[PDB]
PDB file of C-alpha atoms and ligand atoms in Angstrom:
ATOM      1  CA  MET A   1      17.232  13.547  -4.801  1.00 49.47           C
ATOM      2  CA  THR A   2      16.785  10.328  -3.385  1.00 50.36           C
ATOM      3  CA  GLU A   3      13.972   8.506  -4.832  1.00 50.10           C
ATOM      4  CA  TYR A   4      11.711   5.307  -3.297  1.00 46.88           C
ATOM      5  CA  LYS A   5       9.635   3.109  -5.350  1.00 51.46           C
ATOM      6  CA  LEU A   6       6.860   1.691  -3.812  1.00 51.63           C
ATOM      7  CA  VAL A   7       4.011  -0.324  -5.249  1.00 50.87           C
ATOM      8  CA  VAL A   8       0.240  -0.519  -4.160  1.00 51.39           C
ATOM      9  CA  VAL A   9      -1.034  -4.380  -4.215  1.00 51.72           C
ATOM     10  CA  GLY A  10      -4.615  -5.613  -2.766  1.00 50.70           C
ATOM     11  CA  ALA A  11      -7.600  -6.997  -3.675  1.00 50.92           C
ATOM     12  CA  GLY A  12      -9.792  -4.932  -6.008  1.00 52.55           C
ATOM     13  CA  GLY A  13     -11.586  -1.893  -4.542  1.00 53.64           C
ATOM     14  CA  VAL A  14      -9.783  -1.857  -1.283  1.00 57.28           C
ATOM     15  CA  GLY A  15      -8.090   2.078  -2.335  1.00 57.85           C
ATOM     16  CA  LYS A  16      -4.963   1.478  -3.480  1.00 58.69           C
ATOM     17  CA  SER A  17      -5.830   4.406  -6.128  1.00 58.07           C
ATOM     18  CA  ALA A  18      -7.638   6.582  -3.402  1.00 55.05           C
ATOM     19  CA  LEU A  19      -5.095   5.900  -1.007  1.00 54.35           C
ATOM     20  CA  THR A  20      -2.964   6.775  -4.044  1.00 55.49           C
ATOM     21  CA  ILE A  21      -4.401   9.756  -5.330  1.00 55.63           C
ATOM     22  CA  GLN A  22      -4.682  10.885  -1.934  1.00 56.89           C
ATOM     23  CA  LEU A  23      -1.265  10.905  -0.816  1.00 53.75           C
ATOM     24  CA  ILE A  24      -0.462  12.880  -4.427  1.00 54.27           C
ATOM     25  CA  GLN A  25      -3.095  15.798  -4.373  1.00 53.05           C
ATOM     26  CA  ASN A  26      -4.571  15.511  -1.552  1.00 50.93           C
ATOM     27  CA  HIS A  27      -8.202  14.477  -2.481  1.00 51.64           C
ATOM     28  CA  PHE A  28     -10.580  11.589  -1.932  1.00 50.93           C
ATOM     29  CA  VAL A  29     -11.645  10.099  -5.173  1.00 52.19           C
ATOM     30  CA  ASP A  30     -15.876   8.360  -5.185  1.00 54.39           C
ATOM     31  CA  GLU A  31     -15.129   6.358  -8.739  1.00 57.19           C
ATOM     32  CA  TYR A  32     -11.440   5.514 -10.210  1.00 59.14           C
ATOM     33  CA  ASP A  33     -11.689   2.868 -13.107  1.00 60.88           C
ATOM     34  CA  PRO A  34     -10.816  -0.807 -11.607  1.00 66.19           C
ATOM     35  CA  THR A  35      -8.771  -1.389 -14.328  1.00 67.41           C
ATOM     36  CA  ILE A  36      -6.489   2.202 -14.595  1.00 69.61           C
ATOM     37  CA  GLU A  37      -3.031   1.130 -13.745  1.00 68.60           C
ATOM     38  CA  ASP A  38      -0.842   4.135 -13.853  1.00 70.89           C
ATOM     39  CA  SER A  39       2.677   5.636 -11.468  1.00 70.61           C
ATOM     40  CA  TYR A  40       2.827   8.583  -9.857  1.00 70.20           C
ATOM     41  CA  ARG A  41       5.721  10.708  -8.465  1.00 67.69           C
ATOM     42  CA  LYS A  42       5.273  12.893  -5.439  1.00 69.70           C
ATOM     43  CA  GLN A  43       8.010  15.194  -3.919  1.00 71.29           C
ATOM     44  CA  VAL A  44       7.576  14.377   0.104  1.00 72.14           C
ATOM     45  CA  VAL A  45      10.137  15.266   3.100  1.00 75.73           C
ATOM     46  CA  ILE A  46      10.742  12.456   5.668  1.00 75.83           C
ATOM     47  CA  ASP A  47      12.610  12.463   8.544  1.00 77.83           C
ATOM     48  CA  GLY A  48      13.946  15.659   7.154  1.00 79.99           C
ATOM     49  CA  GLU A  49      15.179  13.718   3.969  1.00 77.88           C
ATOM     50  CA  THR A  50      13.761  15.585   0.505  1.00 76.89           C
ATOM     51  CA  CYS A  51      12.952  12.622  -1.577  1.00 73.97           C
ATOM     52  CA  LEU A  52      11.058  11.182  -4.375  1.00 75.13           C
ATOM     53  CA  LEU A  53       8.019   8.888  -3.918  1.00 78.55           C
ATOM     54  CA  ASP A  54       7.371   6.387  -7.455  1.00 78.94           C
ATOM     55  CA  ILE A  55       4.359   4.761  -7.165  1.00 80.96           C
ATOM     56  CA  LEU A  56       2.926   1.914  -8.695  1.00 80.49           C
ATOM     57  CA  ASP A  57      -1.005   1.331  -7.823  1.00 79.04           C
ATOM     58  CA  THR A  58      -1.481  -1.850  -9.064  1.00 79.94           C
ATOM     59  CA  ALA A  59      -4.916  -2.743 -11.164  1.00 81.22           C
ATOM     60  CA  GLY A  60      -6.209  -6.076 -11.833  1.00 83.29           C
ATOM     61  CA  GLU A  62      -4.195  -9.810 -16.775  1.00 83.59           C
ATOM     62  CA  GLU A  63      -1.276  -9.950 -18.155  1.00 82.76           C
ATOM     63  CA  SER A  65       2.352  -4.256 -18.858  1.00 86.22           C
ATOM     64  CA  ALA A  66       5.959  -4.279 -19.115  1.00 84.72           C
ATOM     65  CA  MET A  67       5.377  -0.839 -16.400  1.00 84.64           C
ATOM     66  CA  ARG A  68       4.077  -3.454 -13.758  1.00 85.20           C
ATOM     67  CA  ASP A  69       5.990  -6.005 -14.509  1.00 82.02           C
ATOM     68  CA  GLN A  70       9.317  -3.953 -14.322  1.00 84.18           C
ATOM     69  CA  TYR A  71       8.042  -2.873 -10.732  1.00 83.60           C
ATOM     70  CA  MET A  72       6.998  -5.711  -8.880  1.00 83.55           C
ATOM     71  CA  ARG A  73      11.189  -6.479 -10.249  1.00 85.26           C
ATOM     72  CA  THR A  74      12.810  -3.558  -8.585  1.00 87.14           C
ATOM     73  CA  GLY A  75       9.987  -1.957  -6.292  1.00 86.71           C
ATOM     74  CA  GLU A  76      11.393  -1.451  -3.140  1.00 87.08           C
ATOM     75  CA  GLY A  77       8.297  -1.356  -0.695  1.00 86.27           C
ATOM     76  CA  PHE A  78       5.043  -2.930  -0.711  1.00 87.09           C
ATOM     77  CA  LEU A  79       2.031  -2.053   0.616  1.00 88.09           C
ATOM     78  CA  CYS A  80      -0.058  -5.005   1.003  1.00 87.84           C
ATOM     79  CA  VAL A  81      -3.686  -3.290   1.919  1.00 87.86           C
ATOM     80  CA  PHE A  82      -6.681  -4.238   2.625  1.00 89.14           C
ATOM     81  CA  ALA A  83     -10.488  -2.943   3.238  1.00 91.55           C
ATOM     82  CA  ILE A  84     -11.582  -3.012   7.434  1.00 93.73           C
ATOM     83  CA  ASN A  85     -15.235  -3.872   6.696  1.00 90.41           C
ATOM     84  CA  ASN A  86     -13.901  -6.707   3.744  1.00 89.30           C
ATOM     85  CA  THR A  87     -12.921  -9.725   5.317  1.00 90.88           C
ATOM     86  CA  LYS A  88     -12.260 -11.668   1.844  1.00 88.00           C
ATOM     87  CA  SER A  89      -9.434  -8.962   1.139  1.00 89.00           C
ATOM     88  CA  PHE A  90      -8.303  -9.432   4.591  1.00 89.63           C
ATOM     89  CA  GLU A  91      -7.896 -13.173   3.870  1.00 91.10           C
ATOM     90  CA  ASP A  92      -6.621 -12.218   0.102  1.00 93.35           C
ATOM     91  CA  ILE A  93      -3.282 -10.536   2.051  1.00 92.23           C
ATOM     92  CA  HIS A  94      -1.651 -13.713   2.061  1.00 95.25           C
ATOM     93  CA  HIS A  95      -1.537 -14.650  -2.007  1.00 92.65           C
ATOM     94  CA  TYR A  96      -0.144 -10.478  -2.508  1.00 93.46           C
ATOM     95  CA  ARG A  97       2.926 -11.104   0.069  1.00 90.85           C
ATOM     96  CA  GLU A  98       3.427 -14.911  -1.668  1.00 90.10           C
ATOM     97  CA  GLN A  99       3.911 -12.860  -4.718  1.00 88.06           C
ATOM     98  CA  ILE A 100       5.937 -10.604  -4.258  1.00 89.58           C
ATOM     99  CA  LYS A 101       8.383 -12.850  -2.401  1.00 88.99           C
ATOM    100  CA  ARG A 102       8.308 -15.207  -5.739  1.00 88.83           C
ATOM    101  CA  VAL A 103       9.092 -12.162  -7.654  1.00 87.70           C
ATOM    102  CA  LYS A 104      11.714 -10.967  -5.543  1.00 87.51           C
ATOM    103  CA  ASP A 105      12.901 -14.264  -4.440  1.00 91.74           C
ATOM    104  CA  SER A 106      13.271 -12.922  -1.966  1.00 90.54           C
ATOM    105  CA  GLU A 107      12.385 -13.455   1.986  1.00 92.75           C
ATOM    106  CA  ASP A 108      13.389 -10.162   3.134  1.00 92.04           C
ATOM    107  CA  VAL A 109      11.020  -7.837   1.585  1.00 94.02           C
ATOM    108  CA  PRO A 110       9.690  -4.437   2.773  1.00 92.44           C
ATOM    109  CA  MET A 111       6.815  -4.303   3.387  1.00 92.24           C
ATOM    110  CA  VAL A 112       3.610  -3.141   4.886  1.00 92.46           C
ATOM    111  CA  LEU A 113      -0.043  -4.198   5.876  1.00 92.84           C
ATOM    112  CA  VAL A 114      -2.472  -1.079   5.435  1.00 91.83           C
ATOM    113  CA  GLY A 115      -6.191  -2.070   6.559  1.00 89.64           C
ATOM    114  CA  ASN A 116      -7.180   1.234   4.839  1.00 90.81           C
ATOM    115  CA  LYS A 117     -11.281   2.655   5.320  1.00 92.49           C
ATOM    116  CA  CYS A 118     -11.297   3.088   8.585  1.00 92.71           C
ATOM    117  CA  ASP A 119     -13.705   5.350   8.802  1.00 91.18           C
ATOM    118  CA  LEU A 120     -16.904   3.036   7.858  1.00 91.02           C
ATOM    119  CA  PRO A 121     -19.572   2.003  10.233  1.00 89.41           C
ATOM    120  CA  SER A 122     -19.022  -1.709   8.472  1.00 88.16           C
ATOM    121  CA  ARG A 123     -15.920  -2.554   9.747  1.00 88.01           C
ATOM    122  CA  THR A 124     -15.712  -7.058  10.065  1.00 85.90           C
ATOM    123  CA  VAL A 125     -12.096  -7.055  10.794  1.00 82.65           C
ATOM    124  CA  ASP A 126     -10.629  -6.117  13.847  1.00 84.55           C
ATOM    125  CA  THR A 127      -7.800  -3.854  14.458  1.00 80.06           C
ATOM    126  CA  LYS A 128      -5.777  -6.672  16.687  1.00 80.27           C
ATOM    127  CA  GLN A 129      -6.126  -9.339  14.211  1.00 80.40           C
ATOM    128  CA  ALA A 130      -4.471  -7.507  11.562  1.00 83.46           C
ATOM    129  CA  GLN A 131      -1.953  -6.688  14.337  1.00 82.79           C
ATOM    130  CA  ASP A 132      -1.722 -10.149  14.939  1.00 87.02           C
ATOM    131  CA  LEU A 133      -0.777 -11.268  11.172  1.00 83.10           C
ATOM    132  CA  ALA A 134       1.398  -8.008  10.787  1.00 84.03           C
ATOM    133  CA  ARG A 135       3.353  -9.520  13.830  1.00 81.91           C
ATOM    134  CA  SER A 136       3.119 -12.774  12.273  1.00 80.90           C
ATOM    135  CA  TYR A 137       5.512 -11.484   9.415  1.00 80.09           C
ATOM    136  CA  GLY A 138       7.200  -8.842  11.391  1.00 80.11           C
ATOM    137  CA  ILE A 139       5.669  -5.875   9.353  1.00 79.68           C
ATOM    138  CA  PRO A 140       4.297  -2.483  10.469  1.00 77.51           C
ATOM    139  CA  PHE A 141       0.529  -2.285  10.527  1.00 78.36           C
ATOM    140  CA  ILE A 142      -1.219   1.025   9.846  1.00 77.21           C
ATOM    141  CA  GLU A 143      -4.884   1.589   9.860  1.00 75.99           C
ATOM    142  CA  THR A 144      -5.319   4.741   6.788  1.00 75.00           C
ATOM    143  CA  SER A 145      -8.762   6.397   5.135  1.00 75.58           C
ATOM    144  CA  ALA A 146      -8.674   7.660   2.117  1.00 72.56           C
ATOM    145  CA  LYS A 147     -11.681   9.836   2.816  1.00 74.15           C
ATOM    146  CA  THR A 148     -10.814  11.432   5.793  1.00 75.73           C
ATOM    147  CA  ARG A 149      -6.698  10.997   5.718  1.00 76.84           C
ATOM    148  CA  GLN A 150      -6.095   9.138   8.585  1.00 77.73           C
ATOM    149  CA  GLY A 151      -2.862   7.130   8.558  1.00 78.89           C
ATOM    150  CA  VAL A 152      -2.407   8.025   5.146  1.00 75.94           C
ATOM    151  CA  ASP A 153       1.526   9.793   5.043  1.00 74.25           C
ATOM    152  CA  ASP A 154       2.291   7.297   8.103  1.00 76.98           C
ATOM    153  CA  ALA A 155       1.297   4.162   5.717  1.00 77.74           C
ATOM    154  CA  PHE A 156       3.898   5.301   3.165  1.00 75.77           C
ATOM    155  CA  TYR A 157       5.833   6.768   5.068  1.00 77.52           C
ATOM    156  CA  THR A 158       6.578   3.973   7.575  1.00 81.16           C
ATOM    157  CA  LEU A 159       6.942   1.923   4.288  1.00 83.66           C
ATOM    158  CA  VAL A 160      10.290   4.078   3.238  1.00 82.82           C
ATOM    159  CA  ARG A 161      11.659   3.963   6.955  1.00 81.85           C
ATOM    160  CA  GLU A 162      10.870  -0.124   6.371  1.00 83.88           C
ATOM    161  CA  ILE A 163      13.195   0.235   2.896  1.00 83.60           C
ATOM    162  CA  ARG A 164      16.055   2.591   4.371  1.00 81.24           C
ATOM    163  CA  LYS A 165      16.463  -0.232   6.857  1.00 83.38           C
ATOM    164  CA  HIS A 166      17.089  -2.540   4.013  1.00 83.80           C
TER     165      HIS A 166
HETATM  166  N1  LIG B   1     -15.392   5.910   2.935  1.00 85.44           N
HETATM  167  C1  LIG B   1     -14.086   4.958   2.311  1.00 85.44           C
HETATM  168  N2  LIG B   1     -14.005   4.489   1.259  1.00 85.44           N
HETATM  169  C2  LIG B   1     -13.039   4.025  -0.007  1.00 85.44           C
HETATM  170  C3  LIG B   1     -12.020   3.775   1.279  1.00 85.44           C
HETATM  171  N3  LIG B   1     -10.676   4.865  -0.175  1.00 85.44           N
HETATM  172  C4  LIG B   1     -11.826   4.131  -1.340  1.00 85.44           C
HETATM  173  N4  LIG B   1     -12.591   4.254  -0.856  1.00 85.44           N
HETATM  174  C5  LIG B   1     -14.099   3.885  -1.387  1.00 85.44           C
HETATM  175  O1  LIG B   1     -13.681   2.532  -2.198  1.00 85.44           O
HETATM  176  C6  LIG B   1     -14.432   2.226  -3.576  1.00 85.44           C
HETATM  177  C7  LIG B   1     -12.660   1.542  -4.274  1.00 85.44           C
HETATM  178  O2  LIG B   1     -11.659   2.481  -4.102  1.00 85.44           O
HETATM  179  P1  LIG B   1     -10.481   1.797  -5.567  1.00 85.44           P
HETATM  180  O3  LIG B   1      -9.243   3.651  -4.627  1.00 85.44           O
HETATM  181  O4  LIG B   1     -10.923   2.589  -7.159  1.00 85.44           O
HETATM  182  O5  LIG B   1     -10.653   0.703  -5.106  1.00 85.44           O
HETATM  183  P2  LIG B   1      -8.905  -0.001  -5.752  1.00 85.44           P
HETATM  184  O6  LIG B   1      -9.471  -0.672  -6.714  1.00 85.44           O
HETATM  185  O7  LIG B   1      -7.563  -0.563  -4.480  1.00 85.44           O
HETATM  186  O8  LIG B   1      -8.159   0.894  -6.445  1.00 85.44           O
HETATM  187  C8  LIG B   1     -14.470   3.993  -4.012  1.00 85.44           C
HETATM  188  O9  LIG B   1     -15.454   4.048  -4.198  1.00 85.44           O
HETATM  189  C9  LIG B   1     -13.348   4.216  -3.257  1.00 85.44           C
HETATM  190  O10 LIG B   1     -14.029   5.733  -3.131  1.00 85.44           O
HETATM  191  C10 LIG B   1     -12.060   4.930   3.197  1.00 85.44           C
HETATM  192  O11 LIG B   1     -10.766   4.850   3.515  1.00 85.44           O
HETATM  193  N5  LIG B   1     -12.612   5.366   3.285  1.00 85.44           N
HETATM  194 MG1  LIG B   2      -7.755   1.329  -8.803  1.00 87.07          MG
END
């Protein structure tokens, strides 16, 4: 079946691991080693197409797998936490890294505002929508805890990859 190679990036603590594990096995993880970087594969059906999502959950330092995923990844989830202003301000660094390593101005990407269940929002929805518009990319609000938007985030990224 078709495989889509996806990479999850963003500041420490924004919920990259929790979003990945919620997608993979439908559970919310309260604590996941901030240094563990692993890849996961899930069969899904997106717009009728049975396919494999091949996901690297990046973490942190100098690996062969991470280098290969950055170079050959087909699409990137750029994650910030809606209660962490710095993580949102850091988003442009991750986008720039992707453009540099891919040597391309046109890389499939989705902006993800995670932790939307929390009572501590400091990044307005419109603020992130405005950023995504300037980048020309989709924006999806998610919660790895409630599952809001989790499938939508990954599936939207697949649909962006398909356009490439
Ligand atoms: N309430 C809430 N907590 C979350 C969400 N996503 C992640 N977390 C918590 O945020 C902390 C950091 O998440 P983690 O997945 O390790 O972040 P990572 O460093 O980007 O991999 C953990 O305690 C998670 O349980 C969310 O959508 N809602
Ligand atoms: Mg992690």
